[PDB]
Design a protein around this ligand. Sequence first.
Ligand code: TPP
Ligand code: TPP
Ligand code: TPP
Ligand code: MG
Ligand code: MG
Ligand code: MG
Lengths: 559, 559, 557
Amino acid sequence: PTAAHALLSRLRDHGVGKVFGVVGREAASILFDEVEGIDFVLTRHEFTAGVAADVLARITGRPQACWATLGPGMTNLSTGIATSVLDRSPVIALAAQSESHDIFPNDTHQCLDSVAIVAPMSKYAVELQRPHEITDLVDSAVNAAMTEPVGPSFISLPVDLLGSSEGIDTPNPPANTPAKPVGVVADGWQKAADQAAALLAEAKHPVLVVGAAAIRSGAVPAIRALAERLNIPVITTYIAKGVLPVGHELNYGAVTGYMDGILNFPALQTMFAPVDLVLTVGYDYAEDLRPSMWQKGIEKKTVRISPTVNPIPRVYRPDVDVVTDVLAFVEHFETATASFGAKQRHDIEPLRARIAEFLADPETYEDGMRVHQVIDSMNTVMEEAAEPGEGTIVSDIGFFRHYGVLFARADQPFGFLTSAGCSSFGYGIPAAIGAQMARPDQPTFLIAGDGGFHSNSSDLETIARLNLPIVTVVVNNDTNGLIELYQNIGHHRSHDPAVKFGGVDFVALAEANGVDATRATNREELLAALRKGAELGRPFLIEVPVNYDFQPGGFGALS
Amino acid sequence: PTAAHALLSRLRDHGVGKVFGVVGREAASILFDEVEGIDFVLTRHEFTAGVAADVLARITGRPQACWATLGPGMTNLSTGIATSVLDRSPVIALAAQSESHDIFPNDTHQCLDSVAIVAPMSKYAVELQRPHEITDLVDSAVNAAMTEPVGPSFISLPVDLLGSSEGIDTPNPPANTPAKPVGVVADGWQKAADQAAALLAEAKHPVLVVGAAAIRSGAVPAIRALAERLNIPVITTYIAKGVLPVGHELNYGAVTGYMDGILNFPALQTMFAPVDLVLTVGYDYAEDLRPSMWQKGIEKKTVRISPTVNPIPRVYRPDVDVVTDVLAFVEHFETATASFGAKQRHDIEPLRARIAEFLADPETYEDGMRVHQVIDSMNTVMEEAAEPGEGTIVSDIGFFRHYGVLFARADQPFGFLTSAGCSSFGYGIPAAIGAQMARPDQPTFLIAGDGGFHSNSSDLETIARLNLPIVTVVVNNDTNGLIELYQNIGHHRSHDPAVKFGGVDFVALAEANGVDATRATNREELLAALRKGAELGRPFLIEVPVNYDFQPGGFGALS
Amino acid sequence: PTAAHALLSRLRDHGVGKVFGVVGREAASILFDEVEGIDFVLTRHEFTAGVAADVLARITGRPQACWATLGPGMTNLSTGIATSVLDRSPVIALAAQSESHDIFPNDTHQCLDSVAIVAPMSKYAVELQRPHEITDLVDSAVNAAMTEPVGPSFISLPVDLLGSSEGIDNPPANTPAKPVGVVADGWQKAADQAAALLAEAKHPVLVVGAAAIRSGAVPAIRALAERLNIPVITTYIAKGVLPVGHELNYGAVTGYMDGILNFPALQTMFAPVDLVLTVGYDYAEDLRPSMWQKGIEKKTVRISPTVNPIPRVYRPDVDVVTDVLAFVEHFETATASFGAKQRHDIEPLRARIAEFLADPETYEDGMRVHQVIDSMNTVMEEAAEPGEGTIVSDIGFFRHYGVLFARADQPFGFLTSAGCSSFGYGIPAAIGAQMARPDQPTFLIAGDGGFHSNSSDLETIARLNLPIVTVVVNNDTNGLIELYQNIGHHRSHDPAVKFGGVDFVALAEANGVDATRATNREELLAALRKGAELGRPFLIEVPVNYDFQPGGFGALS
Ligand SMILES: Cc1ncc(C[n+]2csc(CCOP(=O)(O)OP(=O)(O)O)c2C)c(N)n1
Ligand SMILES: Cc1ncc(C[n+]2csc(CCOP(=O)(O)OP(=O)(O)O)c2C)c(N)n1
Ligand SMILES: Cc1ncc(C[n+]2csc(CCOP(=O)(O)OP(=O)(O)O)c2C)c(N)n1
Ligand SMILES: [Mg+2]
Ligand SMILES: [Mg+2]
Ligand SMILES: [Mg+2]
């Protein structure tokens, strides 16, 4: 009864039921059957393991776990670790190491200096040295992972020590897993919150800009109630879509810096130009809603609320900085603003008409579908398939992803999932896995482009193996499309060798992994394929040819 | 006329004609058309890019180059960088970074502290800060990469700075690209080489254990002629197979720690038991030919020759350490042993008969073929399709790979290619891309297992796009088979969730990528498929079902 | 029979006979009497320890050892370690650490992440984990320390493991006799391209750095300079590769020399030169290309047992990566048939230097440093056998006087820190020099700022009874820093550079070191001569001033 047993056992004490990963030669020291209640989920690549853990942690609000072997196992896991550190999830990342007496980084076969490599991208990074201490190392790893900003903690596991029973006796101290993240609180945050209240009283047209940290804090209903009483519009980051239901009058949409260019419309100015006060509730620069995007029209005052000290004062100098828990802020703020008269909210109907018209685009095109037609079709079938307040749409990374930000339906928090911080291509499959496992009885759709999807398409076999009924839509234009956009922004022409592919048959690709698939080229075909996939009870994949029709004109918000 | 131009231009100055990678939003600062004579080679994943550069650099003996975007681009590339640092190749690894004024690691969108992450796995790692200095940074990278132990040098490139002309005026100074690696040389190595010559004189059965460093030094012809004259047997690491031709009487084969167990034979004993002196020529612990593998039978004396100070005295205390250039050691050694009488070489025919017995195995099995029969067939068609002294068989990582070490034909240096130091699965495809480009007119076969091959299978599309006529054999037992072996060694049983896959049709998978394919299930079908493949003028893939029937007991030498 | 025994024992196997340091609570695990032939040398501060080890290692060409306790011990040592890495010496730096099971950097009492802190300023840094491995850690440390650029290797020692016998039940040491270096393929060819440039050149020179001394290349370089009539210019510590008076000894360079001499000295030394061969080049020594780039563009040849670390600054026309001696030997063969050269004229500069050193004036306030060093040279020529003696200089403005004017009659006859240049360097460098040359005279000159930064080790000099003679030149100021205020801002600001008075005579005497005051040439010469024959340490304080000219130091940019 070994450090391997103690490791899995202590993960179980913190609520972990799954370890995602790829096991290497450390299998001699750990089978993964040591502890009842914890199953191994084998992936085809370690990146998929890390991201699935990241996403499962986001939705459940609980620490999750991933696994890799030494050397290149750990470097492959590192892109999932990076997904967790930038996107913010409590992930315990574990990787094997050469035998302790044989650790010579870059000399011993497969031996890298794992801790030096991972420390800069993690909350906590350590190497096991005495087997019995693994219990305290898991606890210190959970501790750091669950402190804002939440993130991954890394433990490197030399193979001999992982298989040793030395110092281990068969009375586990309580876990005390935080039920929500530990945050930082400044003295006199209440006073700063009052100052923010005084700005709100003076303001004629305020907004709440909500980030995901507001969801982790459990502040969604409270923010909604605040917004409704005072008639304050709510604008979101990519993943805070769904903090208000679809069709709510205060749901002013999500922001992407690509929105003016995509909609051929002055969207950011319509959203922000008349605004005189911006409250960034649960702000986090990594979500990529930057100050420059709301600095439109008149001068604005700002209020930052975050359970962290502001790491970017070069970029964001709020008039009022409130360092405290988000829910605690909203409760204090409700009391301070109880006497305030409801505001007159600014008009964004022209932007709403523009969005609705992109989604309703009834044209049939020569080359492919347009991505807005694809998402609108995905919305229709999601709403049919899902109970109200349920369903997840997931987006991989690419130009199409920003169409997801503007157009995809989100009827609950995390109802639209993508990687805002790290934005690694191929994120889609592992995210759809994590999401479907978190929400077992809910439809899970994935949209991905050909570039990013194929970067990580091999874990289609994992989707089949686990029998997760994810419906995937690959939008194909045989290009790294986002990158062709940037070629054009910077140089006013393309260069195909850096961005162009030959053909891939994603239908045939899906079928080789044992996933049923079909091609769809217009709304009618796409709708039928989605509805078949949703009702299939097995995963399903739909390939859709697309084109973008871009005009490098309106993309200045990207500077 | 920008730092992008100055970067690509200085790579062209050091001989580089290709840059492998994936390009992100830095495409706004760099098209990859700025410089005649350097082309971009787009992959589906950055790992592929870094490994192709590593192999192309190994075979050409000249610095090569790979490329990634910021954040996850850089971390994906790092498995390639780790390949380069552990296998020893001179790679210039390049990654974009957030705009210089906006570099806040783990806060700014996609911003990771790239230098801190890569420095522990590289020879040199730096961030560009003033545009015109990109010329001297490239040189300093080449400098550190071409010093032994050769390895990767990393440059992080903030997007603003890459695209800036500030400080750049177009007359470039001379490159002085080292023609072969700069190495370290101890004072008095001539004296230590004479002590080694005196030990050779007084020895009944010496051997030369030859590592890849000896090939890098250009020492192969010289080693051959010393071995021939004095009747000294030559034993090699995985990748130094072919330093003598196949059939040569002194070609005593390659060592792998897995050999007694695969062969069910005391192969290490037969190979080393009566040997009284081991000359490890170009020794490098990373190749995984460890002292404990030749420590069989009688007390041996050892002589280490390397162009590096000994990094692992805990594990290898040679009787004579000769720190110098390998070629210079051999020339001095010829001089001091010119009048010595030739030796009686020891008999290893029992081992040879056992290896030949595996290769000739004519049994049809109920389940699939056996990997030794798979490799025998590849040897036959490689000898047919390749000129003498030519051809490359490439191996991915897994249990099958060590069958490769024992059985695969290699008629020149690097005629058998696999990753000996880092051993990342998915290696095969990119190593074969690199091998095929370095040897445009030679046949290039790849063998990979299903675990490893599917880990990086998406880059079949790259093989089709570049039209490289690589013949790929996938050996499929629906298992991470090597890992199931380690489960059985450690625990005396399997655990399927950590190692077992569902069905993947690699024939259909390849064809979905634009590569023609076919299933072969016995020697007759395999030979027919391999013959077709080698004559197609197009890539081809062959799926072969296999099984291992392993014997967990005979792998003691792995500890 | 403990890891402590095994560590000391392996240090003895590598020639080490002294460990310099300060011992903390790790004394419970290590006494320093476990091995005959290795003694402990207690200092007052760990910096002194590290620097004494660095200087003993440079002069002896052999690895040396220093020691500190955990946390602040190790950080104190680190200025010593920084001295070794920048100045180039093979030092084994040893520090204790918290018990292995209690290592929580920045939470455990006195616990710092020692390896992370020292890795960036060392050749090798590691923490002990299993007691018996200390033997191989010591060997890997010596290996990395004795590879060019030579430098310090650090081993962190948790107290429990240090005092444990677990697994402890010896193989040969193989200490390199001289540094391991790198060597490019085609270096013989690049050295021939250099000989072709020496043939086509009218006024070549040899700029020599200390790495030529480590290579054992000094005799060989003399011969090549004599036969081909090439002048030899040096870095601060390569002074004395040619004897005093030798016609080819063109002295040492320092970017402060134009400004101090009030004379276009670099112009004189380098204007008409057309080929510069930087023999054993090392940018850390602070003789930079800008200092020889006077007049006509020169061609340059670099010769170092290392690849060029600084191509942004020094792009030689020819780069010869190889051992220095081996380069010289191969260059002799290629230049065997060459006729001697016409060496350009620098008498005007020699005359200005001599004129400084002879300065007979008597200044109201106190002496001038050029007069102090002249008096030092005179008494050192008397006291010391020929080819012998050591003048050590601490850091500050006066040190650049030391570079120009101080007598060096052997390699390392003038000692200062060229690379790291920490003030307080002087005492420990004089301690190490005196120990390496037990029967030679050892003089130290230091300023009041630097001397006082590390003056407490006067008691160590007394305790070890090393007959060093120290001259503290006191102007109640960090004078060098006042100069830089004036270069940058055209005025002074006293709160950043001025002290009140310190009586260094009384300070010395408080430490049990005899001392006296001296205010002119005659008082100074009597003090030095008394001190050189005292058979005990001795200190002399001399009031000085500088009256410097800010506008003449354009060369420092
Ligand atoms: C790991 C990684 N490398 C490079 C990039 C740059 N990049 C971002 S999304 C993307 C994919 C774009 O192509 P695709 O998935 O087809 O979407 P499209 O833009 O064509 O709609 C790429 C290459 C990235 N995001 N992640
Ligand atoms: C990047 C990476 N992760 C994990 C491993 C552990 N591992 C080594 S090879 C391998 C693949 C083994 O399966 P397969 O390629 O089919 O070869 P087989 O052993 O079945 O013959 C695995 C999972 C690895 N080598 N590299
Ligand atoms: C550790 C350290 N801190 C600060 C300095 C800057 N500095 C260099 S030498 C020196 C001393 C200058 O005064 P002093 O030793 O009296 O010599 P002076 O310039 O007066 O001749 C100082 C402060 C330094 N060299 N080293
Ligand atoms: Mg695309
Ligand atoms: Mg397999
Ligand atoms: Mg002073």
